[PDB]
From a paper:
We investigated the PP2C family member SpoIIE, which controls the activation of the cell-specific transcription factor σF during the developmental process of sporulation in the bacterium Bacillus subtilis. SpoIIE is the most upstream member of a three-protein pathway that activates σF in the small cell. It does so by dephosphorylating the phosphoprotein SpoIIAA-P. Dephosphorylated SpoIIAA, in turn, displaces σF from the anti-sigma factor SpoIIAB to release the free and active transcription factor. Like other PP2C family phosphatases, the catalytic center of SpoIIE uses two divalent cations (manganese in the case of SpoIIE) to deprotonate a water molecule that serves as the nucleophile for dephosphorylation.
Previously, we determined the structure of SpoIIE590–827, a fragment that included the PP2C phosphatase domain but lacked the adjacent regulatory domain. Although monomeric in solution under physiological conditions, SpoIIE590–827 had undergone a domain-swap dimerization during crystallization. Here, we solved an additional structure for SpoIIE590–827 (with an amino acid substitution A624I that was designed to block domain swapping) that was in a different crystal form and was not domain-swapped. Importantly, the only significant differences between the two SpoIIE590–827 structures were at the site of the domain-swap. We hypothesized that this structure represented the inactive state because it lacked the dimeric interface of the SpoIIE457–827 structure. Comparison of the SpoIIE590–827 structures with SpoIIE457–827 revealed that dimerization rotated the switch helices (α1 and α2 of the PP2C fold, corresponding to SpoIIE residues 630–678) approximately 45° as a rigid body relative to the phosphatase core. Our structure of SpoIIE590–827 reveals that in the monomeric state, V697 packs in a hydrophobic pocket between the β strands at the base of the PP2C domain and the switch. Based on the universally conserved architecture of the catalytic center, the M2 metal of SpoIIE is predicted to be coordinated by the side-chain of D628 and the carbonyl oxygen of G629. G629 is at the junction between the switch helices and the β strands at the base of the phosphatase domain, such that movement of the switch helices could be coupled with bringing G629 into position to recruit M2. In support of this idea, G629 is not in position to coordinate M2 in our isolated phosphatase domain structures, which we thus conclude represent an inactive state.
Residue numbers in the entry: 587 to 629, 633 to 817
Write the structure that this text describes.
């Protein structure tokens, strides 16, 4: 009934041309008992109902205990159905188990997620499943074991691709995450945003969005620290 881990979260979001409403969507929600779920998507009132619904489906498959290849082709089937061509939407989705700190990620697109553990910053990525096996949406499904203190950073394509005069976007983000010293999720969100906006001198070509989640021990409020 009491969870061993807890989550602290932050989020920054900007719109095209310094606008007031963005078309990036994100959500971070408890998802039943012991899980916690983070999602970002790019690509209407009814639209965000259909999205949340497909996200719910993808959630349940991700959590089903199914082999990763099967999940991949199942998810492709789901997406082919209830999607058209001429819709090129992206989705990064991560779900943390709040008892063991295990985590399942699912990626559709070319925008990378990252874990920061101390001074390492790992890009979370899956292999191309072998040739001859089709993958219509280049869906990726990765499982990692997290530890307390870990940062998880997820971003929209607009912010990943945002830094001007920068050829390797992956490596630029990597560096900028390495260079942070704060462990605050929200400070980290806002800092990353400012670094890419600084690079384009204030102009905002796309909706830009990043969420950060720190993973902590769920230590009761009344606890005191112990000493050496």
């Amino acid at each position: 009934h009491h969870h061993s881990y807890r989550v602290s979260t932050g989020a920054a979001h900007a719109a095209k041309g310094g606008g007031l409403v963005s078309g990036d969507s994100y959500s971070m929600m408890e998802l039943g008992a012991r899980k916690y779920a983070i999602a970002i998507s790019d690509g209407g009132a009814r639209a965000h109902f259909e999205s949340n619904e497909t996200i719910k489906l993808l959630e349940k498959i991700l959590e089903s205990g199914i082999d990763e290849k099967i999940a991949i082709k199942t998810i492709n089937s789901i997406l082919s159905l209830r999607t058209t061509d001429e819709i090129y939407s992206t989705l990064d989705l991560s779900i943390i188990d709040l008892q063991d700190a295990s985590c399942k990620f699912l990626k559709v697109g070319s925008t990378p997620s990252f874990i920061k553990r101390g001074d390492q910053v790992m890009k979370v990525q899956a292999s191309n499943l072998p040739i001859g096996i089709i993958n219509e949406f280049d869906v990726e499904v990765v499982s990692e074991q997290l530890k307390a203190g870990d940062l998880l950073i997820m971003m929209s394509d607009g912010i990943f691709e945002g830094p001007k005069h920068v050829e390797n976007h992956d490596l630029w983000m990597k560096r900028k995450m390495k260079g942070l010293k704060t462990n605050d999720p929200q400070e980290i969100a806002d800092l990353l945003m400012e670094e890419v906006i600084r690079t384009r001198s204030g102009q905002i070509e796309d909706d830009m969005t990043v969420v950060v989640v720190r993973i902590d021990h769920n230590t009761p409020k009344w606890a005191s620290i112990p000493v050496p």
